[PDB]
Amino acid sequence: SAVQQKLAALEKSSGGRLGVALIDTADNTQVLYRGDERFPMCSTSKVMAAAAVLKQSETQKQLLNQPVEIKPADLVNYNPIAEKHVNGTMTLAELSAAALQYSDNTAMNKLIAQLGGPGGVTAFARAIGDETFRLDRTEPTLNTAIPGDPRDTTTPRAMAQTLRQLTLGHALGETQRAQLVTWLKGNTTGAASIRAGLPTSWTVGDKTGSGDYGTTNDIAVIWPQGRAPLVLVTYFTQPQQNAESRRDVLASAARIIAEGL
């Protein structure tokens, strides 16, 4: 198609490997580029950890208010929010918001621990029908993004269908889904990625991710005005271990998707 031609040209211009999955909920049509190839998820995996805790709270009705201790030994490499509460507590709601809206890596590890380890996050993916997602490590080693390493990867198609079910479907209860949507819409890290390629008028909720090998990711639910929502996943990784992040590639992919409605 035309969009596949331009996405292929974008990739060629960039020197990296680009993966895209779009779901248009209006007719359940899909646009895919390298949709079945594995990409390192990096921080986009935080969406699944938060979703898994939200699912837990459908039964444990007060779980999100449960306080969790933040101690100096919990701090890893990027802890913008948890640092503000060392030697205090944060609730699981506050930890989920920090992981999602600020990509706090300590918050992610607390969520992994609440679920019983990386296998508890992966188990949730399987329980909603995602047989591709795999979380293997905690923060920060899950970001090594080594070429060919299947650990901590998913595919664009799989992540698009899962993100659809979590935010617009009913994988979660009603109050839980609305909380996830509210959280994604208030992300602070995404201004230069998918958002930068879309009309200023559309509402976006997204989660970014970055890691070694110049890995630059963004997953998003998009609410155009007067139009059914869209789900867009953009994954990007590069051949050199020390390559720079390329958020512009993600904005460009989104702009190519958007021009063709």
Active-site residue identified among 1, 13, 14, 43: 43
The rounded radius of gyration (Å) of the Cα atoms in the chain is 17
Q: Please name the residues in contact with 73: beta carbons below 8 A apart, sequence gap of 6 or more.
A: none
Q: Which residue has the tokens 């991710």?
A: 209
SS3 248: helix
Strands of the sheet containing 230-237, edge to edge, are 29-33, 17-24, 230-237, 215-223, 203-211
CA distance 182 to 186: 7
Residue 43 annotated as catalytic: yes
Give backbone dihedrals phi and psi of 191, rounded to 5 degrees, phi first: -65, -25
Tell me which residues are annotated as active site: 43
